[PDB]
């Protein structure tokens, strides 16, 4: 049995379910939440369930969490311009908190698809090379082309050993 | 950490001095206390020599000017 | 251990595999120094033919000579290999039959 409570939180599939990818402006997200209370329950679940997913998609963002420092839970984002975005998450479900932060400071689906396509621009199916980078190492693999001499011996007339002998004979 | 204003009055009235917890624990034994004492003494002497050299160097420059 | 304890310690420490009689080498060449008999641990009762050899590394070791009858003598050259002699305690080397002075058992 995997240790801890809700061990599914420690699986790559769960971490990859996060949908909040912050804009490049976002630099820090401080989380102020209370460990005891009734109006801060959604905030506690957000730290428990969602903060791992947010960090997984935003490795360069500093997430620092503070406990029992204020009467109410809130989120404060620090942007690169110097702006500070305060969010109030009291009486808000963890799902509501995730959707709110996605709207205000989350990249849209269109933007992300463009980056994924751009990332693969230099991979070409026609390119030949190692399996790590390319589909086919050599043109011998293609159908109709001359096969590799190791797999199929070349005709005698196409071999340097044979051609050299004829030149001596001439 | 919660009410600093109350904290200040309480210590002043009750006459209690509060020292903050030290970040790092320091081990203590005869060999350490003796080596740590020399290192402080060696440093101080080196800095005293530097100060004397600076005064002599500046004094010579002042005379030339 | 707790997840915090597993994190602070990381993967379990694995001591490196100890080298054996050949010092992590397929075979070694040694010069015979003496030929003697060793008595197997009881319940085994025999007169096993062994020899002391000075290996190329420079150390001196005892090597069991397999086969029924050997012609080895002092100053001969042999190629020793790994493999412990179970009944003979301390004999972790064996002689290779058919190499250098040592020859194949003489089927008679």
């Amino acid at each position: 049995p995997m240790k801890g409570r809700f061990p599914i939180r420690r699986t790559l599939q769960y971490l990859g379910r996060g949908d909040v990818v912050f804009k490049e402006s976002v630099k820090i997200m401080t989380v102020n939440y209370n460990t005891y209370g009734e109006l801060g329950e959604g905030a506690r679940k957000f730290v428990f369930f969602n903060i791992p997913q947010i960090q997984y998609k935003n490795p360069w963002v500093q997430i620092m969490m503070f406990k029992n420092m204020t009467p109410s839970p809130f989120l404060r984002f620090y942007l690169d311009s110097g702006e500070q975005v305060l969010v109030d998450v009291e009486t808000k479900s963890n799902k509501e908190i995730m959707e709110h932060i996605k709207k205000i400071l989350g990249k849209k689906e269109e933007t992300l698809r463009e980056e994924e396509l751009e990332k693969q621009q230099r991979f070409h199916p026609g390119n030949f090379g190692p399996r790590k980078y390319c589909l086919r190492e050599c043109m011998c693999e293609v159908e109709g082309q001359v096969p590799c001499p190791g797999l199929v011996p070349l005709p005698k007339e196409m071999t340097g050993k044979y051609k050299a002998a004829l030149k001596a004979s001439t | 950490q919660t009410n600093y204003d109350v904290f200040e009055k309480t210590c002043k009235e009750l006459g209690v001095e509060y020292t903050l917890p030290p970040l790092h624990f320091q081990k203590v034994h005869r060999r350490f206390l003796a080596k740590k004492a020399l290192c402080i003494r060696v440093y101080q002497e080196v800095q005293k020599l530097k100060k004397q050299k600076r005064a002599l160097k500046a004094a010579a420059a002042a005379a030339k000017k | 251990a707790t997840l915090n304890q597993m994190h602070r310690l990381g993967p379990r420490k694995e001591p490196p595999k100890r080298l054996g009689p050949t010092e992590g080498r397929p075979q070694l060449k040694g010069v015979v120094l003496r030929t003697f008999i060793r008595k197997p641990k009881k319940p085994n009762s025999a007169n096993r033919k062994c020899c002391r050899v000075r290996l190329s590394t420079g150390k001196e070791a005892v090597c069991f000579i397999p086969g029924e009858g050997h012609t080895l003598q002092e100053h001969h050259v042999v190629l020793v290999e790994g493999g412990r002699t179970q009944d003979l305690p301390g004999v972790k080397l064996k002689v290779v039959r058919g190499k250098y002075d040592c020859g194949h058992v003489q089927k008679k």
Binding site: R9, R10, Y36, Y56, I63, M69, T70, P71, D88 | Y4 | -
Partner: protein, 113 residues
């Protein structure tokens, strides 16, 4: 007005020391994923920051701004803001003094003092 090279253009941390002149030692923490466990833990870093007015106290949360030119070997940041003062927190949501999970001044009232 080119910005710093350092990645940490903005760092939040706690003032763990203030014994240097006009400098505050700040401990920041980030979350790092353990590859074996797939769990996040706290990796903490120490940042020296220029406290021009010596207005920092141990235990208070602060925001640091990366300096354009390193002031010294270790001082590459300045004190942008004191997010939370030690024991003197002011609730961002309501704006009223608080002492833990309680209001020193009720939000219903309007003292304006």
């Amino acid at each position: 007005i080119v910005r710093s090279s350092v990645h940490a253009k903005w760092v939040v941390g706690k003032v763990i020391g203030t014994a240097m002149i006009k400098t505050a030692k700040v401990r920041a923490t980030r979350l790092v994923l353990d590859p074996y466990l797939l769990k996040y833990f706290n990796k903490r870093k120490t940042y020296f920051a220029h406290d021009a007015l010596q207005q920092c106290s141990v235990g208070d949360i602060v925001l640091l701004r990366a300096l354009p030119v390193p002031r010294s070997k270790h001082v590459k940041h300045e004190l942008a803001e004191i997010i939370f003062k030690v024991g003197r927190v002011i609730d961002p949501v309501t704006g009223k003094p608080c002492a833990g999970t309680a209001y020193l001044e009720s939000p219903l009232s309007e003292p304006r003092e």
